[PDB]
Write a protein that binds this ligand. Structure first.
Ligand SMILES: Nc1ncnc2c1ncn2[C@@H]1O[C@H](COP(=O)(O)OP(=O)(O)O)[C@@H](O)[C@H]1O
Ligand SMILES: Nc1ncnc2c1ncn2[C@@H]1O[C@H](COP(=O)(O)OP(=O)(O)O)[C@@H](O)[C@H]1O
Lengths: 87, 143, 68, 96, 507, 155
């Protein structure tokens, strides 16, 4: 309208909505694990081998997100991975 | 070796890359019927060729290169040497509309840089702003 | 055909003759001519108008030739 | 080609009000920060006035000229580019 | 009768653009660029030059305005407004019966009556003292400029104007454009600008070897015919080998010996040369008791053609025994500043002095240039005719009243167009009142009722408040030739636009 | 040398810009010797002096004086709105506190109560306010004189 060019839906009302819904949708594809259970997920990228994994590290390392709210958490995840072992 | 303007078709446009020698700065003008700007450019080139016979000027009807074209191929000029492009021009915005009298030769001398005859002067440039100029003057006077 | 092209030639001759009609005698208005370039020429002479004018009709062409 | 009305002042007041409403939540220590990203995904956080006004894509030419004039007078004192568009917009609204 | 209507429509459209740009309290226009730019300015000439139209009448009016601005320099805005007003008041009301014959005679009679009224109202003035001229210049220049060093600039400009006049012989010809330029050199105090001889020499003279010092010799400049040519008119010698290069030295020695035997008795110095510089031939040339300079641009050419009077012709040798170089001229290469400067004093064609100013950056250069330009223009417009008229909006009312009285006394048939063209002169006071911000009807009625008593023709409208004030206490005066030229140009434009019949095409 | 370290991101440039602005403010506060209080305690007194103690008696001048004085109270209103309180209650409270006492009353960003900014530690500059006023006047002056906007130009 004055600043953006019909690209993003930001303004004075998306704060209490999209900034939380993005993180909710990002975390919804993760609560299926966390615990000794058999919830294997197949990963298809460039190797073309069809392999199933269980940890969320390899799942997040292959998913490509296009949102700053979702990218603000992968940095903390990588920092925690570099610091201690699990977590 | 050249000082006249002739009409070519398609064979000369291909043979110029082999007939030119010692870096010949050839110029090709796409003429369009029904536009006085093309006539003015031709009248200016008729004198520019006699002023400097060290290069070559040719004219061609805009119907050879890509005949299936709408109304986007605006008439302009194309400078070539041995097969390299030196920033071609398009549209009448670079010329200055129908108020061109002594800017084409200056732009040509600035783009070439080999036959400069003391023509390093700056153009008239568009009108300046009354607020930015006043702000700059106040800043210069305060400091 | 026959009586149509003759009427067309007569109309063209009348149209080309109704141009220098308002310029006969010492008291007359001026006429402006453009060369489809940008320059304009103001003159009120019949000979200068008949000499500097485009033509495309055969009857008008032969009339201008006879006038010259 | 021919225009003899008062729509110029109207659109100028509208652009001034829009520029004042766009930048008005960055005053005081309890303000909200802003982020800018477009080139190859470069996250850049900012909250200053001149830094924001110098790196933005404004679609209005009058607002762009106003921002340029405001930034051209920032090399005099320290930081005075902020808390300026609000008073100008209020004065323009009162004049209108 | 549709071409005249379409012409006056475009004329009024062009005139109704820069109408609100007159007086001290003028508006400001703004032009947007198609790429995404916007420039605000309050100059009518810039808007007229940056505009693009397609009607021949608009282009003719633009060319007429440009010619009027280039010839005079003051009064290139109200002409179009007056022409448009006269057209809209005459042709758009007196052409319902189609009679374009008596209108030309009515316009000529109105122009003659206006000229007679403006000539029978002027007051004489004296040019003996200098304080009155400076006061008039300061009052006429107080428009929209700075006020800090205007007195010294105007005094220097008046001195340069009084010193540049020397071509008097009965016609009073004054040329200051191509006769006096401006020089700039940074460094030093800014309070030292004055007048000097002025020689366009910076870094053109090159002396590799140290020779004698130039005190007060007799320099006689020649021509420029010693470059990379083939001789006089034949191709017997051509610069192609080293043998020809070393024979050129002997040829030049023989030529200078022939010149010395012909007409060399005052021993000249430097000569104009466009091509010819080396490390061996130049040494022999300097040893041949002669010097030569190079690197000549357009400014040096204009200087040697105006001050010295050098011409361009195919005749380097065998000239006049008393052509140029008559008088003792000093040429000491001073080291003041940082570049080589020449002060050619007392030579041929005197009264060609230039200015000498030492400022700082480019802003000072531009401001002193525009100050000198406007002051010289005002001085030339004032000295051209020692007659002043009280402007502001007092002479037009008296002219209109005299025209109305003459029309009522003659009792003619064509009185309607005469009255229409006489009542179309109150546009400037109405525009001034509208720009000031007051009533344009009551003020006009009061001004019309005031200009009809007994001995009252100097009461105008103030351009800063909006009240009627006498011109004898304010100090607003204008020259006489400018108003006459404006009226003549307006009448000629109206006559040219009124004598247009049909428009066709040709080659 | 002011050596700084960060957690390897883009906040280091922000910290550098902040310390540069702080150094600039310190340099500006050391060239002069007069420092006036801030926290929104100068616009209220200015408006009170422009409204009450009028320099002259003229309706035409007052029509502009009132508009210029009513536009200087936007800073405290915006501050109170961004702090999380009301807009008119704090305004009339500060007005009553300034009318009853007579000292420079500031704006508190904690409880919304009128307090004195001359005893806490909030300070400002001197030439900054003058430059801001000059810029605002220059901008507001060369805007209302716009007549018409035409579509032309080629360069
Ligand atoms: N102090 C004043 N009192 C009365 N009239 C004034 C005063 N100052 C300027 N004017 C009027 O304003 C007009 C300005 O004309 P100007 O815009 O200079 O014409 P141009 O654009 O053709 O040079 C003058 O004709 C003059 O009569
Ligand atoms: N410690 C403080 N307490 C209350 N208000 C403050 C304080 N510091 C600054 N302000 C307010 O912030 C405003 C200016 O903030 P800002 O626009 O960010 O510029 P700056 O960063 O130079 O202060 C001032 O009007 C002032 O009232």
């Amino acid at each position: 309208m004055l600043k953006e060019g019909a690209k993003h839906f930001s303004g004075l009302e998306e704060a209490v909505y999209r900034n939380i819904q993005a993180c909710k949708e990002l975390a919804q594809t993760t609560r299926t694990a966390y615990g000794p259970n058999g919830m294997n997920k197949m990963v298809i990228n460039h190797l073309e081998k069809l392999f199933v994994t269980n940890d969320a590290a390899t799942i997040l390392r292959e998913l490509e997100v296009q949102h700053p709210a979702a990218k603000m958490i992968v940095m903390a995840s990588h920092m925690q991975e570099q610091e201690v072992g699990d977590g | 070796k050249f000082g006249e303007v002739l009409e070519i078709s398609g064979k000369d446009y291909v043979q110029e890359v082999t007939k030119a020698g010692e870096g010949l700065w050839v110029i090709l003008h796409l003429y369009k019927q029904g536009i006085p700007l093309c006539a003015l450019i031709n009248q200016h080139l008729s004198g520019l060729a006699r002023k400097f016979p060290d290069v070559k000027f040719i004219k061609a009807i805009s119907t050879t290169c890509i005949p299936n074209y709408p109304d986007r191929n605006l008439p302009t000029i194309f400078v070539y040497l041995e097969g390299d492009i030196k920033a071609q021009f398009i549209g009448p915005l670079v010329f200055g509309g129908m108020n061109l009298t002594r800017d084409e030769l200056e732009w040509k001398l600035s783009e070439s840089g080999a036959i400069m005859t003391d023509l390093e002067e700056n153009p008239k440039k568009p009108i300046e702003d009354v607020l930015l100029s006043s702000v700059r003057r106040s800043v210069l006077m305060k400091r | 055909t026959g009586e149509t092209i003759r009427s067309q030639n007569v109309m063209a001759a009348a149209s080309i003759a109704n141009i220098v009609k308002s310029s006969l005698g010492p008291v007359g208005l001026d006429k402006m001519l453009v060369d489809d370039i940008g320059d304009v020429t103001i003159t009120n002479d019949g000979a200068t108008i008949l000499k500097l004018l485009e033509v495309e009709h055969p009857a008008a062409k032969v009339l201008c030739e006879l006038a010259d | 080609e021919v225009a003899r009305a008062q729509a110029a002042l109207a659109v100028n007041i509208s652009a001034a009000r829009g520029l004042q409403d766009v930048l008005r939540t960055n005053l005081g220590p309890k303000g909200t920060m802003k982020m800018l990203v477009s080139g190859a995904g470069d996250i850049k956080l900012t909250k200053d006035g001149n830094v924001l006004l110098h790196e933005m894509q404004i679609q209005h030419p009058t607002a762009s000229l106003i921002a340029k004039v405001a930034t051209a007078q920032d090399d005099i004192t320290g930081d005075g580019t902020t808390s300026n568009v609000l008073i100008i917009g209020e004065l323009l609204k009162q004049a209108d | 009768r549709k071409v005249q209507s379409g012409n006056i429509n475009a004329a009024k459209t062009i005139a109704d653009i820069i109408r609100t740009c007159l007086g001290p309290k003028s508006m400001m226009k703004m032009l947007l660029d198609p790429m995404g730019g916007i420039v605000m300015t309050n100059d009518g000439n810039a808007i007229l030059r940056e505009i693009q139209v397609q009607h021949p009448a608009a282009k003719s009016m633009i060319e007429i305005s440009r010619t009027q601005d280039e010839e005079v320099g003051d009064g290139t805005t109200s002409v179009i407004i007056l022409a448009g007003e006269m057209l809209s008041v005459a042709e758009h009301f007196l052409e319902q019966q189609m009679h374009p014959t008596v209108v030309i005679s009515a316009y000529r009679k109105a122009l003659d009556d206006m000229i007679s009224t403006l000539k029978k109202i002027s007051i004489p003035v004296d040019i003996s003292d200098s304080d009155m001229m400076l006061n008039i210049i300061n009052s006429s220049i107080t428009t929209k400029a700075i006020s800090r060093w205007s007195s010294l600039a105007c005094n220097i400009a008046l001195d340069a104007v009084k010193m540049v006049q020397f071509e008097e012989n009965g016609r009073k010809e004054i040329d200051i454009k191509k006769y006096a330029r401006v020089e700039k050199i940074p460094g030093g105090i800014i309070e030292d600008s004055c007048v000097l001889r002025g020689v366009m020499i910076n870094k053109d003279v090159t002396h590799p070897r140290m020779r004698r010092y130039i005190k007060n010799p007799r320099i006689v400049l020649l021509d420029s015919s010693l470059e990379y040519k083939k001789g006089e008119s034949q191709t017997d010698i051509e610069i192609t080998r080293e043998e020809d290069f070393t024979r050129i030295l002997q040829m030049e020695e023989e030529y200078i010996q022939q010149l010395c035997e012909d007409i060399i008795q005052l021993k000249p110095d430097v000569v104009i040369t466009e091509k010819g510089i080396s490390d061996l031939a130049q040494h022999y040339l300097m040893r041949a008791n002669i010097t030569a300079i190079r690197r000549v641009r357009k400014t040096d050419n204009n200087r040697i053609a105006r001050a010295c009077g050098a011409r361009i012709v195919s005749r380097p040798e065998e000239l006049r025994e008393d052509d140029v170089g008559t008088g003792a001229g000093l040429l000491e290469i001073k080291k003041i500043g940082d570049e080589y400067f020449t002060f050619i004093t007392d030579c041929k064609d005197p009264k060609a002095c230039t200015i000498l100013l030492r400022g700082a950056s480019k802003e000072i250069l531009s401001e002193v240039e525009r100050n000198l330009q406007d002051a010289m223009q005002v001085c030339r417009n004032v000295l051209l005719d020692p007659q002043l008229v009280p402007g502001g909006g007092a002479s037009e009312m008296a002219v209109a009243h005299a025209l109305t009285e003459k029309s009522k006394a003659m009792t003619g048939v064509e009185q309607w167009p005469y009255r229409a063209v006489a009542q179309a002169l109150e546009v400037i006071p109405r525009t001034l009142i509208q720009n000031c911000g007051a009533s344009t009807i009551r003020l006009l009625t009061s001004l019309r009722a005031k200009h009809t008593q007994e001995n009252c023709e100097t009461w105008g409208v103030n351009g800063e408040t909006g009240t009627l004030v006498d011109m004898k206490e304010l100090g607003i005066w204008e020259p006489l030739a400018v108003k006459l030229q404006t009226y003549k140009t307006a009448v000629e434009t109206a006559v040219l636009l009124l004598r247009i019949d049909d428009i066709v095409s040709g080659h | 040398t002011l050596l700084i370290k960060g957690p390897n991101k883009h906040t280091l440039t922000q910290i550098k810009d902040a310390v540069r602005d702080g150094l600039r403010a310190v340099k500006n506060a050391i060239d002069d010797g007069c420092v006036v209080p801030g926290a929104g305690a100068v616009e209220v007194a200015m408006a009170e002096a422009l409204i009450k103690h009028k320099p002259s008696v003229k309706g035409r001048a007052q029509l502009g004086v009132q508009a210029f004085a009513d536009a200087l109270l936007i800073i405290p209103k915006v501050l109170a709105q961004n702090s999380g309180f009301d807009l008119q209650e704090t305004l009339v409270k500060i007005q009553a506190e300034h009318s009853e006492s007579g000292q420079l009353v500031g704006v508190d960003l904690n409880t919304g109560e009128p307090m004195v900014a001359a005893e806490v530690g909030v300070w400002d500059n001197y030439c900054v306010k003058k430059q801001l006023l000059h810029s605002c006047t220059v901008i507001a002056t060369n805007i209302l004189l716009v007549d018409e906007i035409m579509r032309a130009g080629m360069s």
